Design a protein around this ligand. Structure first.
Ligand SMILES: *[C@H]1[C@H]([NH3+])[C@H](CO)[C@@H](O)[C@H](O)[C@H]1O
Ligand SMILES: [Ca+2]
Ligand SMILES: [Cl-]
Length: 771
């Protein structure tokens, strides 16, 4: 069957129903998400809410409630197959799901799709399932995707998925085949406080335009309430030559399922029974099937689709917003059929658009397949990370020009656009969706001079601190449990208003976004320039010892929020140097002589003092005053890394940078499990992992990928890919820890993890920056 479909060799692959033996688990004491290794590539566009369908076939990882992660298989949601060989009395019917319900429902359906009988493949945004089963003479495959397309802000938003089936008969008998899509009416699955199924009902739409015929089920509710819970789901199929369509509008999901299954298992043909009766307590669902006869050697292809029109997202602080796709389909929540139809009539164009964007990388035969696997599959997080993309506040009067956006750091630390993390994680956005990236950075610019003098308890030490200080960049733009975009600085473990990295990272992200979009967007530099100057001016005030560099205060006052730095640090110091160099450049572009002169003066003093304070002959010391000061830090030259990307030249001597990178490769990579797991954060110069704090002993996936890109830029090609390979292997390989489609922030040497589904590893896209 893989002969009749084209799956790229770089697709991640696993057997349907394969048990994975090696899997990791959280390495922390507090409760932390662990949804198991049974995952797959998500379906759904940016800001739409996403649905994770796993490699076992189940629709199990629900991100439809924006900002929340709910792992539960909705067992009624499936593809099923019927096959009957010409000359047999009976056919066979089978749910394409390698599992079964726990207790109760749908006992009549044929569960437990057998092992060693099919494969799952993923190369985001595409995934595939092949079915090669000795009791199914006709072989089947499906290609499933959403239209996630760089430089496209329309289709990329859509709450839709397409399932393109291919069926091939390798035998010498005629075989009757049916494929059935079932879906529960999930209105009330979340957001509805009482009466969760009440008023749900299903209708059948038959669209008979010539050379189209679509048949679709629309699963909605009789209420017209404008609430997060209300809207519609649709499933449907497009008629193709040689296929007939059948349907069932209403079967009971909170029952044994035999209302539907006795029809399908007989002859693969449903009753075509319409029934718009609303349910009260029972759960209900719909079914759409196709049936056809395959001659020996014959192939047939048929598309199904799924859409969800859930127009309103609500956050825990009370704000309700329309999702981005509503711009294209409307806001009233009765548009699921329009969305489905658009997909069923345009999916072939979308396939080609995805192929067109993937082709430059896939066709580059100098790059290993593993690297391609990771580059594309890490992109899952852009849609799956609780992504919020608004098209107005519900009830909003004054029209607006922009659509605010946010990606979560992760689900365990439910913070939007954590700036210290996006410094690593935002590369795909600037490179592939630059209008979104510039919007986010304008969001940050707009916060710089916000002051909120109310106080909060700091988690690390119990002291009270001001929420938001004028001139200090925020850690984050809110929490999905509170008020994204409106109440910033949701994070409370430390006080980010005294952090020594955020203001620098902010400036560097600004200049990055100018450089990587062609050095043409002077208007973006003009919008952000006051905030850039304010940010550097405020951070200068933190230089207590007058060496020209902000001083770390013997506490975790930066992204390593449990790892103390004291005095001048390699990390914050290098970031400061590069940020000064960037601001000098912007000064030149914008003809701001006083800023150029001032930042140049600050840069020259700071650069001299940084080298003297920290250069030890082999690498740059972690810091000037900590007990662990001669640790080799993987991220010690983060400022120079960004300076390379920004084309700002040498902030530090080339020979010193080279020695430092070589040391990090020889130590932090190669002496940490033989370089097979990434770069550990801190290593002592005797070749022993630094145990001064948990973070020192962790590999950070996104720091590792960033380090790899830096090594690549500096011509250490073999070291770069070796360093990155460890992250790929841990994430995706049979020898790793089973983290596919949930890449975590960190792991320790035992392979166990902290914070699955994390933003930072999107930094693998920095390996694709083109000089
Ligand atoms: C999320 C998390 N604590 C990390 C460390 O893993 C930190 O960098 C972020 O600032 C925090 O919000
Ligand atoms: Ca200082
Ligand atoms: Cl290997």
């Amino acid at each position: 069957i893989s002969h009749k479909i084209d799956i790229p060799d770089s697709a991640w692959t696993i057997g349907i129903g394969e048990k994975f033996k090696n899997a990791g688990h959280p390495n922390v004491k507090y409760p932390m998400i662990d949804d198991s290794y049974v995952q797959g590539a998500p379906l759904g566009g940016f800001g739409a809410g996403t649905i994770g369908r796993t490699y076992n076939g189940g629709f199990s990882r629900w991100h439809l409630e924006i900002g929340k992660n709910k792992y539960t298989t909705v067992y009624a949601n499936q593809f099923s197959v019927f096959q009957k060989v010409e000359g047999n009395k009976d056919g066979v019917a089978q749910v394409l799901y390698a599992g079964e319900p726990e207790n109760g429902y749908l006992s009549s359906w044929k569960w437990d799709y057998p092992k060693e009988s099919g494969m799952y493949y993923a190369l985001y945004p595409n995934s595939w399932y092949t079915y090669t089963n000795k009791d199914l003479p006709v072989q089947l495959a499906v290609k499933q995707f959403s239209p996630i397309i760089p430089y496209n802000y329309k289709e990329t938003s859509y709450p839709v998925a397409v399932f393109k089936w291919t069926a091939y008969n390798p035998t010498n008998k005629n075989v009757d085949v049916s494929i059935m899509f079932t879906w529960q009416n999930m209105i009330g699955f979340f957001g509805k406080q009482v009466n969760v199924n009440s008023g749900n009902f299903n209708k059948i739409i038959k669209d008979k335009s010539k050379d189209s015929e679509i048949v679709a089920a629309v699963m909605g509710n009789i209420s017209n309430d404008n609430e997060e819970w209300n809207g519609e789901y649709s499933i449907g199929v497009k008629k193709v030559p040689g296929v007939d369509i059948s349907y069932k509008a209403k079967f009971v999901t909170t029952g044994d399922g035999s209302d539907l299954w006795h029809e399908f298992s007989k002859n693969g043909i449903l009753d075509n029974k319409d029934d718009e009766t609303p349910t009260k307590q029972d759960g209900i669902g719909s079914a759409i099937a196709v049936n056809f006869k395959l001659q020996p050697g014959q192939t047939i292809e048929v598309p199904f689709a799924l859409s969800w029109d859930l127009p309103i997202m609500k956050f825990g602080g009370g704000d309700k917003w329309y999702k981005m796709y509503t711009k294209y389909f409307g806001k009233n929540g009765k548009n699921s059929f329009a969305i489905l139809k658009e997909a069923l009539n345009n999916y072939q164009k979308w396939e080609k658009m995805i192929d067109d964007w993937q082709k430059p990388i896939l066709s580059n035969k100098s790059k290993p397949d593993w690297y391609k696997t990771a580059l594309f599959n890490e992109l899952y997080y852009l849609a799956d990370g609780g992504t919020a993309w608004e098209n107005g506040k519900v009830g909003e009067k004054d029209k607006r020009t922009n659509n605010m956006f946010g990606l979560l750091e992760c689900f365990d630390y439910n913070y939007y656009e954590t700036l210290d993390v996006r410094f690593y994680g935002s590369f795909p956005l600037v490179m592939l969706w630059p209008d979104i990236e510039k919007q986010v950075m304008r969001q940050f610019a707009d916060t710089i001079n916000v002051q909120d003098s109310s106080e909060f308890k700091v988690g690390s030490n119990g002291a009270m601190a001001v929420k938001k200080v004028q001139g200090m960049i925020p850690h984050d733009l809110g929490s999905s449990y509170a008020l994204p975009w409106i109440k910033i600085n949701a994070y409370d473990w430390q006080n980010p208003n005294i952090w020594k990295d955020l203001n620098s990272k902010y400036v560097l992200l600004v200049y990055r976004d100018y450089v990587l979009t062609g050095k043409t967007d002077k208007e973006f530099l003009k919008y952000t320039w006051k905030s850039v100057k304010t940010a550097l001016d405020k951070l200068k005030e933190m230089d207590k010892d007058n060496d020209g560099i902000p001083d770390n205060e013997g506490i975790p006052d930066q992204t390593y929020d449990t790892w103390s730095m004291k005095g001048t640090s390699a990390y914050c110091g290098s970031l400061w140097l590069a940020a000064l160099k960037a601001a000098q450049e912007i000064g030149k572009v914008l003809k701001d002589n006083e800023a150029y002169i001032k930042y140049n003066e600050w840069y020259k003093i700071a650069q001299q003092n940084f080298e003297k304070e920290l250069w030890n002959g082999e690498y740059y010391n972690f810091d000037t005053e900590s007990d662990h000061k001669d640790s080799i830090m993987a991220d010690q030259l983060a400022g120079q890394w960004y300076a390379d990307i920004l084309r700002l030249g040498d902030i530090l001597p080339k020979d010193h940078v080279q020695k430092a990178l070589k040391k990090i490769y020889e130590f932090n990579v190669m002496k940490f499990e033989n370089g097979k797991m990434g770069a550990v954060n801190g290593m002592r110069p005797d070749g022993i992992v630094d145990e001064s704090d948990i973070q020192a002993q962790e590999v950070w996936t996104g720091v590792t990928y960033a380090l790899a890109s830096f090594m690549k830029y500096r011509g250490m090609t073999e070291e770069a890919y070796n360093t990155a390979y460890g992250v790929y292997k841990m994430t995706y390989d049979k020898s790793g820890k089973g983290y596919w489609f949930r890449t975590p922030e960190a792991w320790t040497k035992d392979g166990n993890y902290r914070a699955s589904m994390y933003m930072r590893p999107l930094s693998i896209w920095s390996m694709e920056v083109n000089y």
